[PDB]
Write the structure tokens for this entry.
Amino acid sequence: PAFAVSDDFQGKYNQGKALNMIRTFSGQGTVVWGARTLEDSDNWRYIPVRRLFNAVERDIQKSLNKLVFEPNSQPTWQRVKAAVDSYLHSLWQQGALAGNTPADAWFVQVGKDLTMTQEEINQGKMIIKIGLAAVRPAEFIILQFSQD
Amino acid sequence: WAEFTVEYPTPLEDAFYTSLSLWFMHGGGKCYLVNEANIADAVAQYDDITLIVAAGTDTTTYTAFTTVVGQGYRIFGLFDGPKEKIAGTAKPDEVMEEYPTSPFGAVFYPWGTLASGAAVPPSAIAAASITQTDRTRGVWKAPANQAVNGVTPAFAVSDDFQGKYNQGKALNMIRTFSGQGTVVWGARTLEDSDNWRYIPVRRLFNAVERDIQKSLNKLVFEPNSQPTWQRVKAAVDSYLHSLWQQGALAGNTPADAWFVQVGKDLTMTQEEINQGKMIIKIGLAAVRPAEFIILQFSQD
Amino acid sequence: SWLDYTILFDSNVPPTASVALRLYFQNGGGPCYLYPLEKADDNGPLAALPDLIDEVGEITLLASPDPDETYRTAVYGALAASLDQHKGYFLLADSVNGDAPSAVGGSAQVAVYYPNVEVPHTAPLSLPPSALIAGVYGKTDGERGVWKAPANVVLNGVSDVSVRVTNEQQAELNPKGINVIRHFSDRGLVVWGSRTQKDDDDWRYIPVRRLFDAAERDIKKALQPMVFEPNSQLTWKRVQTAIDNYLYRLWQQGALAGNKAEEAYFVRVGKGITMTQDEINQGKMIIQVGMAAVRPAEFIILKFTQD
Amino acid sequence: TMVLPGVSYNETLLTQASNDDPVTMPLFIGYTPPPVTVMQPVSVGSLTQANSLFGQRGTLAYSLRHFFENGGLQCYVLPLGPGKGEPAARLQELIAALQTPQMLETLLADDKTGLVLVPELSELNEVDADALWYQGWQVLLTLCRQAPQRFALLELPEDPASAVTLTQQSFSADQCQRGAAWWPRLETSYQDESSAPVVLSPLPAVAAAIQRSAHDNGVWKAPANIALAKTRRPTQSILTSQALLDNQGVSCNLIRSFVGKGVRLWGCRTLLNEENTAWRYIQIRLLVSSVEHYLSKLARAYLFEPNTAPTWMKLKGQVWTWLRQQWLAGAFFGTVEDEAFSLSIGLDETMTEDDIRHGKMILQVRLALLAPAEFIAISLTLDLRD
């Protein structure tokens, strides 16, 4: 890097937006430092938690192009539900998304009356919803001493 | 040496000439010599290259070095120390960042000046220690007490300037003693990490697999069956066990000193079998070099 | 060492800095640093002092061997602010007379050694003892370790104290805790007392202060390579173990005053305990750790009885 | 594509042979007796060798002569230049010569004596000297302190209260571990170019039997009760000096002329003026140091080892072999080897994986201790028998 920035000039540019300076340490050198995106909302910070949701759907959308115009019936609903969670279970053991009892880590549901009732089945729609909790970086590490 | 001498009957003093003189003074092997422009090329070709010397050439060298490890071709390069006489009063790290960090390399400062001839980069000189190491015993032995011949270090360095630069990175100065003369000294990679210090334990895994990954190329397109899987497991472990009973890797009850696991669901589950993919995994106990020595007295 | 000091610097003739520094090496070894400055009120480099100490990662103790009061109190106030952000310093100080100096009023990291020590030179010149008392901390951590209070260690090479203190005003000076250099007949001069400044039962002792100051600096230096890793569960059990195997080795060499049970550490890093969900989103980790240090044994009481 | 049988020659080795122990070597560190260096230790074959070089006359040159004529084995000589004349100037520039940092660079790069000796302190009796007695020794203490294993060798002022107040002084324990003095300076039968005795320091007659008894008996027995060769008497007895009997300052080594036998050495108890630390009884200080020299002798052999438990065992046979002989040579305490010496290298017996990944190679060394039989507590019993 052309400059030597500071220890504290990182501090006033860490809120609001995400300057994300490039700072050189002793030992390890010229390393990047700070992974933060432009907003500060508790859903969308932490660049790796954005790219996790960004790349977990571009492989499902690429695959389901050969499953359109298929009959919207009962053997379809129990096959997509059994094919998605077999991909998430391969992704939970690898440490990508955190949680014990892996029914707690994600959920997948598809049916006839929990979602997509009878009239929007007659229009052809096949709607699903899945939700999962990813991991987040340990940007701040605080540690407490006591006597006991 | 022969075709070298029919190439160079001509006593040069440039460092590569002093290298192959020194290199083939220690025996030496079928060793190549490519320019600073064609590093990756023959590496992509010749599939044998284990070592990368620094003949005082750094600038494009380090980039081409970090180029190919940017595709990771399982080699151990090794660099030169800076030219001469760090004052050592100050300035402790600013002599290091000129060298790219990796688990692959060290610099070996003193510029063993080879009082017969020209000042030789100790990239060439420490390779002779390795040349009489593998010839002595393998790779996991650290080439750290092989003494070289007729080469004089420019500098008789220190113990403390030695000791204060033992950490951080991989200075690894080459110091003359009594008994052992002009001997290599200190073994450590660039990172001071618990996974990677101690260059042979890096170079162990640098050597542990290029045999294996090569060997199983004949074995693809094969029916991914259960009796395949057990059979594949059956060959490695014994070769490990030999290599364990060689004392290359540490650890008793050697299926403790390694492990190995391959199956249908502990590894390589259904759809990626259906995708053709097989995955395996191992992990193992290796030796670590006894670099340091303290000792305790008591009067009991 | 003393050899390379003679190469870079010189010994002049009138001039106490060259005399006070060679007494450091005769007591205890180890390297040392030095920062030369010429004018006491030159607040240019004095303001530029604390941003040079941080870039070298090691600095632990702080001292000033200069004799007079106007130079020392200008220094002690210059870096007094750099003691309370918990990076790990511990300075030393001397007292001009029977009470403590007021440049650093009340802090957990000071230590005052009252009577100044003289030394013969070609009339013997006095010397503030903050120089040679730094070298005696370099022997105690060698064989005995950090957790032993340096009192019975003997000062190596001196004539006599400047003023002779007796036991009846030792009773007054041992509260408002400041230490004392004593003189004995059989064994000569010796340091005495190991109490810090502020006197609540939290930290009244030098080693209990310096044990927590060294245990933090070793774990904080090695967690710095892992500072942006994901906050999942397999990271938690790998950190909680590497802290567990550090206090256990330090327990079984006689530095944590616990009995034959395990009760010397309760390091926990879980999510149900010690944290909850909503501070994961503003990425945090909490390391609740705690020790039980050992106290020095003074005031030994016999209380004989008949039966 | 082809290949020959590849007869594959190799061979193996030998040679533990390293043995030296030059701790028992003395160094004579005087000036030149009036073309040597001012700085280098010089080995001595004999007085016929060395004292014939640069005169048998001087201060060193008599104490040269007083070494092998008292039965030395070999000494070393570090000359220091042509000392000036006016010995009060010579023996204070010597301090400034000692205050050179140029000392230890020739001392830490010496590794061939362990015995530091200047016999020239008799001129201190001639010429405040007690500060020079003090701070000169304070140099000698810190030198041998910062030396790995070297040992200061002193003598007292024969004048009482010049030595007593000198002993009445603050000294750290570590320097009192290493260094002692002899109060009765000796009247030799050397002729002071005349009928007069050369009153020499005991120090060369001291040093002669030391390595010799270390050669003959080993170090572990004693230094004392040795009749001295070429001396008329010790110049002052303890009977005329009832001072220094106050055991409030540090201990001495008395030298006594006996009646029916010679001038017998009568002190071996270091200036740790102390009853419990096994760092009095000077032979104990020096017996360990040569073993330290002997274990360092083989430590650097096992330098860049691997951290394996079998590789530990390779050393474990060696020391168990070696000290066994030595305890069976009566150098050590105990009627079994198990109470003689004990080893405790192991996985978490010395080390851990952190020190395996710090490559440390650690061992715990135990030894039980002998003692000399200094005093004679007789009790009688008549036992009536009717």
